[PDB]
Subunit: 250 residues, 4 copies
C-alpha cells in the first residue's frame, strides 16, 4: 500500500496556474519528473519554472497553445526528446467564459471546443506512443457538467465530452495496459478567486460552500491527491471511471 | 390525456434516412408541420420529399450540410420564413466512423465534432428565437457514450457532449418556457443494416439483441414515440433529462 | 401517434393523496380501469371514492397497509377477483420522515424500508402473474436519492433501491413482454404543501423553486403525463430506464 | 497515504474481498477489527495471520442480520479500540433465485444483511468515528447494469449509494466522509474452488466484458480502500468510486 510514484514521468497540461499548478508541484515534490505546458509567458509561468528548478528532478515547462495542433505536435517532439517515455498524462488545461448562450459567438464556441475537447484529444493521441505498454491517463472533468450552469453550456458540453472520450479509450486500450479516467471537480480555490477582494469573494465562497457536503471549497492539493492515486498501481483495476473530487457538492 | 400534437411545427435535422426519417414521417402523420434537412441529394431525400407532400400538411425538406455554419444560418432563414415559429426541434443528424484511435486523422475528428456537436449547437442557437416562450428541444444521444466502444471514441465524445450542452441550456432557458432533453438510443435497425447481406446482418442482430432486456433491436418508430412524448405537454415538467430508449441494453 | 390507454387495467398504490391521487384520476378520466389502495380512511379516501364513481369505468379503492405482507396478499386476492388481469402497475405508495440519523430508531428505519422497498417488491411480485405476457411496471423514485438530503438517508436509501430492483427486473422479464421503469420526481405540489400556515407556504416553495430549471414545483398531473407515456405502447422500447420528471431540479 | 496507526473496522473479513482488505490494511500497520457470521477454516486461519503480523487486530462473530449482535460487536469495538478512523461495510450475501419464486424470507435475509446491516453498522460507528473518519461501503457495478435472478441483491447494493449520498450531506461538516466502492467481478476462493472447466468458462465470460481483460482481486479493492481511508482523499465524499476494470 504505497503510491510508488518516485521516478515516474508525467505530462500535465496547463501547469502555470490553478489546479494544474498544484498538481505539477505536488507530483514534483513526490519525485515525479513533470513536463508541463502553458499558453502564454507570464509571471505565473516564470515563477513555475523557478520552483521547478528549486526542486530536485528533471522537470520542463514549455509554451504551447493547445488550440494550435502544430504547437501540440511540437510539445510532444520536446517530450519525446527529453523524456522519451511517459507514465502519466493529466489533461488539465481548459478555458471558460460566461456569455448568454444566444449571444455566444461561433468563434468563442470554437475556442472552448478547441482547447477543452480537441486539445485534450490531440494531447492523448500524441501521448499514446509515449505511454507504451503501461500508463495512466487522467482528464479533468467537472461536476457542473451533470448539474448545468447558465451561461456556460459550451463549457459543460466540452467537459462532459471528456467522459465519453475516456470511456471509449478505456475500452480500446485496456488490454494494452493503458488506463483512462476522469476526475470530476467541484469548486476549487484558485488564484483567480483569491485575486478577488473580500466582498466578491467571501460571497462566492459561502455561496458555493453551502452547496457542498464538506462546507468548504477544494484546493489544488486535494485534486493532486486523487491524481496521485490514479497515477499509482494502487488504482490498477480502475479504468473508464469518473472519480468525483468535489466535496459532495449539490 | 392526449398528445395534442396537431398543428405544431417541428424541425428535424437529418430526416432523409434512418431514425430521423421515422421521426419525420410519424410526426407528419400526426398532423405536425415538419421541417427537415439533409446533407446531399439522394434517392432517400427524393422519396422522402414525395411522401411528405402526398401526406396532408405543410412540410419542407431542404439540403443543408450541418458541417457548414452558413448553410445552417440559411436553413434557418428559410425556416423563419416558411414557419415563422417552432414548437419542437430534434437534433438527429449525426455521423459515425470506426477508426483505430491512434490512426484517427485530425480532419475526421473535426468532421465528427462539426456535425455531431457543433452542428447541433448551431441549430439550437438559431432555433431559440423561433421557439419563443414555449418550445421543446430534443437531442438524439446514445447509450453507447456511457458504455464506451472501441474505435469510436470521437463519436462517444460528441454524443456525451450533447448531455452537457442540454443540461446547461435547460437551466438557462427553463424560466423562459424552453425545455431541453436528450434521447439516448440503444441499437436501432436502419436501412444500412437491412442493406447488408443476410447474416452479417443476422449475426450482429443477434449480437446486439443478446445485450438488450427485450431481446430485439429498436425501430425508428419507437424513437418517434419518445419524440412525440417530449414534444407534447404531457412532458411539460421534463427538462434537462436523458431519456433512454434503448431496450434495456447492457 | 396516440396513447391508447382506453380499456387498460391499472393498479396504483397510494392513490388517496398527492402524486398517487393525481395519477389515479388522470388514468381514470382517460378510460383506464384503476385499482388503487391507501393506508387509512380519511377525507381523502372518501372524496377519491366519490370522485371515481362519477366517472365511467370499473374503479376500486381499498385499504391495505403495505407494511403488512398479508394485507398485500389480501389486496391481490381482491385485484384477482375484481380485475383478473393487469396491464399497468404504479408503485407510488411511499413514506418519509426527517430524523437526525444518529437518532433514527431501528423501527422507523424498518418502517420506511417495509413500505418503500419491501412493499414495492411484494406488489410487483404479486402483480407479475396478473400482468401475463404484456405489462408495464412503473415505480416512483426521487431525484433526491442522487443528491442526498440530511435527515432522510433512510428515505433516499429506499428510493435508490427501487432503481436497482427495476434494472434487474427489466433484464429478467423483458423477453416475456414485461417492462420496468422508474419515474424520478423532483418536488411536487401536494395537499401536505397546502396545509402549512404560509409561515412556509412559502419559504419552502421559493427554496425548492429556485433549485429547478423551470422555476416552479411539479404537479401530480405532470407526473401522470409520464405515467401515461410509460403505460402506453409509445414507450414500448423503453425498459430499465430512470425517467426524470423533476423540472430540471439540482 | 499515512495509514500506519489508524483503527479500522471491516465487516465480513474472513473470505474474499473483505479478507484481502483486512490483510492489506493490517500489513500497512492499521489496527483492524473484523467480523464474520460462522466460525470456519477461513476465520481461524485469518486469526492466525493477524497474530503473525502483530498489531492490535480482532476478529469476532457477529451475524449482521441480527441488530442485537451488531450492538454487541460495537461494544467490543468500543472497548478494544475506543475510537475508529475507517469503516468498511463489506459483508454481503447474494443468491440467484427466479424473482417470481423468491421467498419473502430470502428477500428479507438479503435486505437485513446488505442494507439494514450496513445501516446499523454505520449508525453504531458514528459515535466512535468522532471528529474525523472515513466510511466506505462496498457496492456493485451490476446494480447499474441489472442482472437476472438477483434483483433483490441489486436493490440492496443500489440502496447503499442513496444512503451514502445523504449521510455525506448530513455529516460532512462534522468531519465524516462517506463513499461507495462499486466493484466489478472479483476473483475469490469461491471461484478457484470450481473445476477447471466451469471456472475457465466463467473467467472468459466476465473478462470479455471488462476493459482490462481480467477479473479483479481483493488486493486491487484494498488499494481503493486505502486511498479513501487516507487524507489524500479528504475532499472526496458522497462519491461512487468504480473499481471494476471498466466492465460494461
Ligand atoms: N473550481 C474550478 O476551478 C474547476 C476547474 N475545472 C477544470 O480544471 C482545469 C483547470 O482549472 P483552473 O485551474 O481553475 O483554470 P485556470 O484558468 O486557473 O488555469 C488553466 C490552466 O490551463 C492553461 N491553459 C488555458 N488555455 C490553454 C491553452 N490554449 N493552451 C495551453 N494551456 C492553456 C493555462 O495556461 P496560461 O497561464 O498560459 O493561460 C492555465 O495554466 C480546467 O480543465 C477546468 O475546467 C473543473 C471544474 C471546477
Ligand atoms: N443504432 C442507431 O441507429 C444509433 C443512432 N444514434 C444517433 O441517431 C441519429 C441518427 O442515427 P441514424 O439514423 O442511425 O443515422 P443515418 O446514417 O441513418 O443518417 C441519419 C441522417 O443524418 C443526416 N446527416 C449526416 N450528416 C449530415 C449533415 N452534415 N448535415 C445534415 N444531415 C446529415 C443524414 O443525411 P444524408 O442522407 O444526406 O447522408 C441522414 O439523413 C444520430 O445522431 C446517431 O448518433 C444513437 C445511438 C445508436
Ligand atoms: N411529492 C414529492 O415532492 C416527491 C414524491 N416522491 C415519491 O412519490 C410518491 C408519492 O408520494 P407523495 O404524494 O408525495 O406523498 P403522500 O403522503 O401525499 O401520499 C402517499 C400515499 O401513499 C398511501 N399508501 C398506501 N399504503 C401505504 C402505506 N403502507 N404506507 C404509506 N402510504 C401508503 C398513502 O395512503 P394514506 O392516505 O392512508 O396515508 C398515501 O395516499 C412517493 O412514493 C414519494 O416518495 C419522490 C420525490 C419527491
Ligand atoms: N465479484 C465479487 O466478488 C463482488 C463482490 N461485491 C461485494 O463485496 C462484498 C464481499 O463480497 P465477496 O468477497 O465476493 O463475498 P464472500 O461470500 O466471499 O464473503 C462475504 C464475507 O462477508 C461475511 N458475511 C456474510 N454475511 C454476513 C453476516 N450476516 N454477518 C457477518 N458476516 C457476513 C462472510 O462471513 P462468513 O464466512 O461467516 O460467511 C464473509 O466473510 C459484498 O458486499 C459484495 O456485494 C460487489 C460486486 C462484485
Amino acid at each position: 500500500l504505497e503510491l510508488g510514484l518516485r521516478g515516474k514521468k508525467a505530462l500535465v497540461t496547463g501547469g502555470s496556474r490553478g489546479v494544474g499548478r498544484g498538481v505539477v508541484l505536488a507530483l514534483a515534490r513526490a519525485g515525479v519528473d513533470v513536463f508541463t505546458c502553458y499558453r502564454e509567458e507570464s509571471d505565473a509561468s516564470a515563477s513555475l519554472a523557478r520552483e521547478l528548478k528549486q526542486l530536485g528532478g528533471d522537470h520542463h515547462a514549455l509554451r504551447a497553445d493547445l488550440a494550435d495542433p502544430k504547437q501540440i505536435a511540437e510539445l510532444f517532439q520536446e517530450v519525446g526528446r527529453r523524456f522519451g517515455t511517459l507514465d502519466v498524462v493529466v489533461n488539465n488545461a481548459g478555458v471558460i467564459s460566461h456569455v448568454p448562450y444566444a449571444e455566444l459567438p461561433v468563434a468563442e464556441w470554437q475556442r472552448i471546443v478547441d482547447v477543452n475537447l480537441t486539445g485534450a484529444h490531440l494531447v492523448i493521441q500524441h501521448a499514446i506512443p509515449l505511454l507504451g505498454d503501461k500508463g495512466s491517463v487522467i482528464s479533468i472533468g467537472s461536476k457542473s457538467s451533470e448539474v448545468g450552469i447558465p451561461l456556460r453550456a459550451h463549457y459543460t458540453a466540452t467537459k462532459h465530452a471528456l467522459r465519453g472520450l475516456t470511456r471509449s479509450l478505456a475500452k480500446e486500450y485496456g488490454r494494452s495496459g493503458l488506463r483512462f479516467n476522469v476526475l470530476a471537480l467541484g469548486v476549487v480555490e484558485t488564484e483567480e478567486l483569491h485575486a478577488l477582494p473580500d466582498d466578491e469573494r467571501a460571497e462566492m465562497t459561502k455561496f458555493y460552500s453551502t452547496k457542498t457536503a464538506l462546507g468548504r471549497l477544494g484546493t489544488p492539493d486535494e485534486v493532486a491527491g486523487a491524481v496521485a492515486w490514479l497515477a499509482s498501481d494502487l488504482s490498477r483495476y480502475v479504468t473508464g471511471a469518473t472519480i468525483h473530487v468535489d466535496g459532495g457538492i449539490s
